[PDB]
Paper text:
Most of the [name]+ influx into mitochondria is mediated by the [name] RNA Splicing 2 ([name]) channel, located in the inner [name] membrane. [name] belongs to the CorA protein superfamily characterized by a highly conserved Glycine-Methionine-Asparagine (GMN) motif in the loop between transmembrane helix 1 and 2. [name] assembles into a homo-pentamer and displays an overall architecture similar to structures in the CorA family, with slight differences in the secondary structure arrangement. Along the pore, R332 and M336 have been identified as the main gating residues.
To investigate whether [name] undergoes conformational changes in response to environmental [name]+ concentrations, we depleted most of the free [name]+ in purified [name] using dialysis and addition of EDTA and performed structural analysis by cryo-EM. The resulting structures of [name] in the presence of 1 mM EDTA (referred to as [name]-EDTA) with C5 symmetry and without symmetry applied (C1) were determined at an average resolution of 3.3 Å and 3.6 Å, respectively, with the highest local resolution estimated to be 2.7 Å. Unlike TmCorA, no significant structural changes can be observed when EDTA was included in the sample buffer. The Cα RMSD between [name]-[name]+ and [name]-EDTA is 0.481 Å. In the central pore regions, densities for [name]+−1, 2, 3 but not for [name]+-4 were observed along the pore of [name] even after dialysis and addition of EDTA which should remove most of the free [name]+ in the solution. The GMN motif is known to have a high affinity towards [name]+ with an estimated KD of 1.3 µM36, which may be able to trap [name]+ in the pore in the presence of EDTA. The conservation of [name]+−1, 2, 3 and the loss of [name]+-4, which is just below the R332/M336-rings, further suggests the gating properties of these residues and that [name] remains at low channel open probability without activation. While inspecting the [name]+-binding sites found in the HsMRS2 structure in the presence of [name]+, we do observe scattered densities in soluble site 2 but not soluble site 1. However, due to (1) the lower overall and local resolution of the [name]-EDTA structure and (2) under EDTA conditions [name]+ is not expected to be found in the position that is exposed to solvent, we speculate that these extra densities may represent water molecules coordinated by surrounding negatively charged residues. We have not modeled anything into these extra densities due to the high uncertainty.
Numbering used by the authors:
A (entry chain B), B (entry chain C), C (entry chain D), D (entry chain E), E (entry chain A): 83 to 400
The structure:
């Protein structure tokens, strides 16, 4: 029998954690097994006057009088759930002239938590990517640190995953924003209690507030998308600059090797005559006392002359 | 006379396989030859109150009282058709409080089978691509394994084909979702029996359930599209990293070759004087007992001195 | 006086070819010179109850009682026009229970001919591109065949032109599909004879059949677009693989050249002492009978020792 | 006081050029300074029953009874304005059965002039780009002509500017086409004279003719956009082919240099023993008359043997 | 207690700067803390008949009778605010026949200031990018200046940020333009004073003027977007040209090094026989007076012959 771990938050901020089976939870919440499947990483749906919304590892169901967190154990949710969420859900402080229903505060808190996690992911990825790209770009080494290439690849993969997460968050919010029926379905207290909504319709709950809230969070996600796209474009531009760094530095060694090759070729060409005169044969010139010094001087001078003439060749032909 | 191989599933899950001609099948189904052409890899159409839908090798026609599978032989469909489809079509288990008509279950089963095949293709492609890219990226070899390049190319081609398949599946579902007339055409039992629909309109069959089903499968296909796009982006990023791996490692050998070229050039330059003094001529210095050792020491020391001076050159010019 | 070469097909499939001037043709067809300009490669328009449609070299005007082909000479249209089009336009065979008007058959025949030509272009381009990319990708040669690069470039240009042709064909069909007024304008016989349409409105001619026909041809063109896009993506991926093939193979020769450079540098370094002892001077060691063999053995052993020590250098520094 | 140079074309094709101030021109035309600012490169607006439209250097205002060209001096407009525009505006020839108002002819003439200039720019850019890419692609040279790279870069920049111009022209036409109010605003004579329009509504001026005219020019601009996009794709493909041309040809020289390095390494390795036996020491073998020839033969044969063995190495290791 | 620095502009252009707390400012403006959060870089909203709009560092709130600038200190706004904004807000000069309300002038002034700042950013970035790309592209150096690569990278990052800023400015303007309710909300004086609007409805304030103003600024931002996109495309094309510059120049040094390698290989091959005859052994040919000169001539001639034969090899094999 599959089971759910449920953390229930009341309208007063009270936190109660219990242990209830899935089949009993369906009857308690007035839902069916197909509603609480949680097979989508980003989904915000309203089934049977219950707001069922999921963000990766954050699965929550919002009821008119309570908020439930499902499958929260061993997911680093032990700090926010018991020290930040009750404060936001209790309604302490803030503007008391227009207290919105519980579902509005629950949706706002969950959306803010997800936007904060996305902002933290981006603000962790950005400095690492910047510090990795600021070292490979620098033209003070012939090659790049091969150890940092794996770090760059992992950071790029994480950035792609973060971009996908922000894109699906934006799509999920925009789906509710565009369709007026979907946005009106979020008014759980209106349909659950159609007699209090008319009496308390003095700005307490209306489509304008939900429109503004969802637009604010969609704009925050759009800002995050713009920042992530800028970071990815920066990664691509830095890689293109590195491609020029490893090619322009190679040409320097090409030129040095070519110059040394000309030098050693001239040296070998003029030492060829020395080897020819070095054979143990009869050259008919061993009696002369000036031929040796003349040959040595000719060799040494012509080596430099041919080296300079060849050095002019690479300066002429580019 | 062209023929069809038909596998018929009744409302009770009974499986009957027979052998009927195309012309007789058109009369039996009340269709024409143009409807059952199956020239599109992904198409879901409703012609003459019959749901004609095709997924690559899966050609099926859904009738109010039966489901037909056409051209199923020799396509690895001998396990699902006779061991999984009857269980899903029989309606055993699940929620008995709202049994939907047969066409809903048939569409759900076919869509789930195609989404499962796409998920299997993706979950087969992903580990191979990851293990191929994790070996070429590693900077422990001067070159990359040329055998794995063909594997990477074939995996990329398969990923492109899978992306096209998921894209056309999403388009086929979204075409039905967007147009309300197309979605209403799926209610085959409503138009076939317009007198039972009104009596059994207590949540048994309505547009909401089909909207939710098609949205669920479109969202599953969208998740698969996101995963495939992430994999393709990872492939491109890994190829860009390999391009830096094969260029930064080349520069290391460039530097080593340049250093050795400077060393051998200095050695040849200082051995030139040894060759000059090695000729079988009169150098006017053979009588001295210290000129040979002085020349040898000068040669050996100046070789290292010129080598160090040239080694400073590549450290100065980057 | 500009002239037109007209091939006229009657409702009975009769083919009559005559020679009529443009000015007289305008009066005969009830059109103006601006209608029959044919300045667009892909255009399907209905002017003055005449369907004027053009596909590159295929210019045709459809009339209620006849179909005209304009400028057909010397364009390889001498086989289809007189051996395939009359059979399709005669209405022989097929379903006789619902004979559509002549304009429907003419539009279907022209659209099918263009889709067949596009399919032939794609099925000619694909094998050549595949066989060209299967040879350069193979890592059995240091370089790639430079002759096949021009073939690849021409095939890529032809693929781009084919993609543009399919894109404009899809756009032309979708323009008619989206606007209901444009699709209703195709019912030439309805507006020409508003008294037979009502009497023969028993499924003979209605918007459903034209919608299905145009959707079928748009889906065929979409399949061709998907295939062409897959081929282009394959071309790009294969080029990226070749870029790794010509860079990883270069590193192999880099390593071999570096190893040989270390070997020859060690050989020169240890032959330097042999050259130093080879001078025609007084080394004060010519009387010893063991110095020569000791020096030779030291040279030969130290050459290999230094070669191994340098070979360890490239294995340590990657 | 800022001034305007105005060229006025009457309904009879008369050309009058005068010199009027901006402030007086505003009163004469019944406009304000904000209307005649001409700060947009591509804009077609109708302000106060006056069609104010601008195309880069072509600024014109269309009035019910006249057409004005503003700032035409020193812009190579001295041929079209006084030798082509009056002929088109006079209405000579053409179809006299349906003469449209003056504003239609003026808009058609200006749009045709701009489309002709864009076509000329494209037909000038295309041959130069083709002839530049047909020389660098050819694999008959080790390198590419560095002089033609600047020509290619300038042609690419000009192609990008032309693509932007055609894109903004298409956007300007489509803005009028999509909104029916904007298209109806072009009927200047209808609003200026609401009593002649009803009497002369027998096909002289209606929305159909303007729709067809703007659609024709939008389709011409779309054809130009397709051609420019094909040219840009061809440029990118040719650059990718050149990248393979400069890398596959480098590998040929790599292989030749490696082969020569093996040859010279074998030569040095076997000449090491000759240098060792060439020292001026006691080798204890000078008395033998066959050791010298044996050593020389061993050297010469082993040089080739080691060269062949090393040549097998690059054939084994790819 | 958080505080705001407010610069208040009256309808007469008077500038008053004071120091008011956020909580008191909310009561004075009739707003709440959630309205004046300024968490979006580009946002234009109308809350409680107050136009709250922000552009990066420019935060302003527009009231029916005054304009407030918030957080203006130490942001280089001390020149425009006190020397340009009062002149524009005073309404001096211009067309006095149709004076629009204060909110129109304030929105126009703020939008013009932001468009001027964006134009200045673009006109500063463009010359630097052009001068940087005009030096690396030039094929007069083997390598590119590594110092200018960092300048190019920083300029590319700044261009990406500018493109994002212009994109979000265009989106913010288009959001107001598309929705008629949002544009009507900008008429602050209409809702604040619903009795003066009807009396002064003689062209003083209507939707047409705001539509034209927002369209003008959206078109200016679109021109800036086109220019920035052209600059980015130019950057990419120039980088692609540099990639050919550093590869075609490398091949020149490849060819020179190969030619010198052939020369030195021929020299070593023919000096091998000189070394063989140079050994201190019995060659049985020392008595001949012509063998030495013959060997030397053969060596010198065959060196050049083999060099030419090898030079033909690279001319044959490309
Ligand atoms: Mg080398
Ligand atoms: Mg050497
Ligand atoms: Mg000697």
């Amino acid at each position: 029998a599959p089971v759910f771990t449920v953390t229930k938050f009341d309208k007063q901020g009270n936190v109660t954690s219990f242990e209830r089976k899935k089949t009993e939870l369906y009857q308690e919440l007035g839902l069916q097994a197909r509603d609480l499947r949680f097979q989508h990483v980003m989904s915000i749906t309203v089934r049977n006057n219950r707001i069922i919304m999921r963000m990766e590892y954050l699965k929550a169901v919002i009821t008119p009088e309570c908020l439930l967190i499902l499958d929260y154990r061993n997911l680093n949710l032990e700090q926010w759930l018991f020290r930040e969420l009750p404060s936001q859900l209790s309604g302490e402080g803030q503007l008391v002239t227009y207290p919105l229903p519980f579902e509005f505060r629950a949706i706002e808190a969950l959306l803010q938590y997800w936007i904060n996690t996305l902002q933290g992911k981006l603000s962790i990825l950005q400095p690492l990517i910047l510090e990795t790209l600021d070292a490979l770009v620098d033209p003070k080494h012939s090659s790049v640190d091969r150890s940092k290439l794996h770090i760059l690849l992992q950071n790029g993969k994480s950035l792609s995953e973060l971009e996908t997460d922000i894109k699906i968050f934006k799509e999920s919010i925009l789906e509710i924003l565009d369709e007026e029926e979907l946005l009106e379905e979020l008014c759980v207290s209106k349909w659950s209690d159609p007699q209090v909504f008319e009496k308390s319709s003095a700005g307490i709950d209306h489509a304008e507030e939900m429109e503004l809230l969802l637009e604010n969070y969609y704009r925050l996600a759009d800002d995050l998308s713009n920042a992530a796209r800028e970071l990815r474009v920066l990664i691509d531009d830095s890689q293109s600059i590195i491609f020029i760094n490893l090619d322009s530095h190679r040409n320097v060694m090409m030129r040095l090797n070519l110059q040394l090759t000309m030098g050693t070729f001239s040296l070998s060409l003029f030492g060829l005559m020395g080897v020819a005169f070095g054979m143990n044969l009869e050259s008919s010139l061993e009696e002369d006392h000036r031929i040796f010094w003349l040959i040595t001087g000719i060799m040494f001078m012509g080596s430099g002359l041919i080296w300079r003439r060849l050095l002019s060749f690479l300066g002429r032909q580019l």
